[PDB]
Amino acid sequence: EEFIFRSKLPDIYIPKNLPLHSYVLENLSNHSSKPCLINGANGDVYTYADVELTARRVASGLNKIGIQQGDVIMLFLPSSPEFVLAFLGASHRGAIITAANPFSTPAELAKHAKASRAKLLITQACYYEKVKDFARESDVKVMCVDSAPDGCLHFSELTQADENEAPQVDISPDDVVALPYSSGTTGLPKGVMLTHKGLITSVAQQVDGDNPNLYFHSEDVILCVLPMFHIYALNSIMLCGLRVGAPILIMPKFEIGSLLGLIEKYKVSIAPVVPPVMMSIAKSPDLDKHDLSSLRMIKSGGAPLGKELEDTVRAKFPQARLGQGYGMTEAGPVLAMCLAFAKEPFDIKPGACGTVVRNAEMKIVDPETGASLPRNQPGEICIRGDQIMKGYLNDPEATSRTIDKEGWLHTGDIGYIDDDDELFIVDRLKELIKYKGFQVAPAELEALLIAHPEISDAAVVGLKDEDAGEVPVAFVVKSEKSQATEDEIKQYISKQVIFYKRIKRVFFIEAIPKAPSGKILRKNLKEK
């Protein structure tokens, strides 16, 4: 009956005519000599001035090697200063950045490059072997940041290019700048088109305003142990950090012992994490061997946070305020943010994932009738605002079933909003499986299984797991006289997919339960 929810914070001014790099580096002059990017693994450091200049050099270098405005560049790198420099340089060039986990298989990397139409791939030499075959076969340029195996280019060709040769580019706020992949509410992984305006809006919703929803001040140091090739770290850590002028302490590889030492050494104050990471930190027996007094904020997002883990963290890190952030790639990605993180904080309740961001609208709809619901009534969470995606790359039908005719993005998540405007996520409508914060699309694994000569049908479902949250398991229908075993099938999948998409168990059945239409009755399967 038309119930629209909004933030408890007032709307603020958000630019509608600026390129992403111009916006996040807008107040550069106020802290140009300050550390911007710090590699916690090797000590490398770039000041804000260094970053701004290098981004322009990268843009000049990209043009020099034939990369044009509108072209897609694919990063195959771990979180690092290099990733950020490449991203900002591409933005300055009017180019687009798509990225994949460097631990992806050769099959995944090629499929990603082909689907995104990447014209350049940037990675590390230790991962080059996985792109070699594809490289010298698709005419795509390959570049490495360390050594330059074969005839690949070197990243210095970009970082050390002449900034005076940076091409003059006219960038529209509606131009796409990032292309993260996501399976959305159903189906296979798709390219999510995020624009300059969309990302700017999402960043502003989090850190701008007299009373920012996510308050980061001058003395803060933000930890980046999450992957920049995914939206959480890209937006809430990288872009938000740059916008507020805070130094970003990057950890290319998560290691408890090292992290604790880095927190003391660099006085890390903000720790954006995911449940799996939080649990590892909590189980650490060395918390007393380091001074972690600088930590003042721990933000969990990307997956459900159980009460027990929430209680454990509050008990082990009493010097910090614990809270959640709720986001979805297609949403820009932040939908709601803990108001206890605001400059002038609001009270919050345990288990809540935050309050809908300002400069946006949220509604909860009955999954079957589409009707809007009032407070305390669970339904599908929908959001509308300039921060959402433009749409899915080359996939109009997927876009049409995700963003409705009135501009509302449908999340596939079930939740409700209480009397204090705090949002609670209680279930999931969509088939998405989440392993340690990573997306595991059942349809993707299903397609791979069915491609097997001895498999006629299959269905993949998520199995509850204390350590990863959910682990994928498969129900398989073998061909008539197949002698294939559980382990043989698992090995078949393990060789083609990234480590976290491996199927934990294979159950053989006679048929996959489907609706009269043909849709897989996943509810039935999960029910064993």
Ligand SMILES: Nc1ncnc2c1ncn2[C@@H]1O[C@H](COP(=O)(O)OCCCc2ccc(O)cc2)[C@@H](O)[C@H]1O
């Ligand atoms: N706080 C949460 N609690 C429960 N479930 C969540 C939460 N956060 C995200 N999810 C689930 O994860 C799905 C989206 O998966 P995607 O890989 O596209 O984005 C993952 C990143 C989400 C994020 C980004 C920026 C932030 O500041 C905080 C979180 C949501 O639809 C939910 O199903």
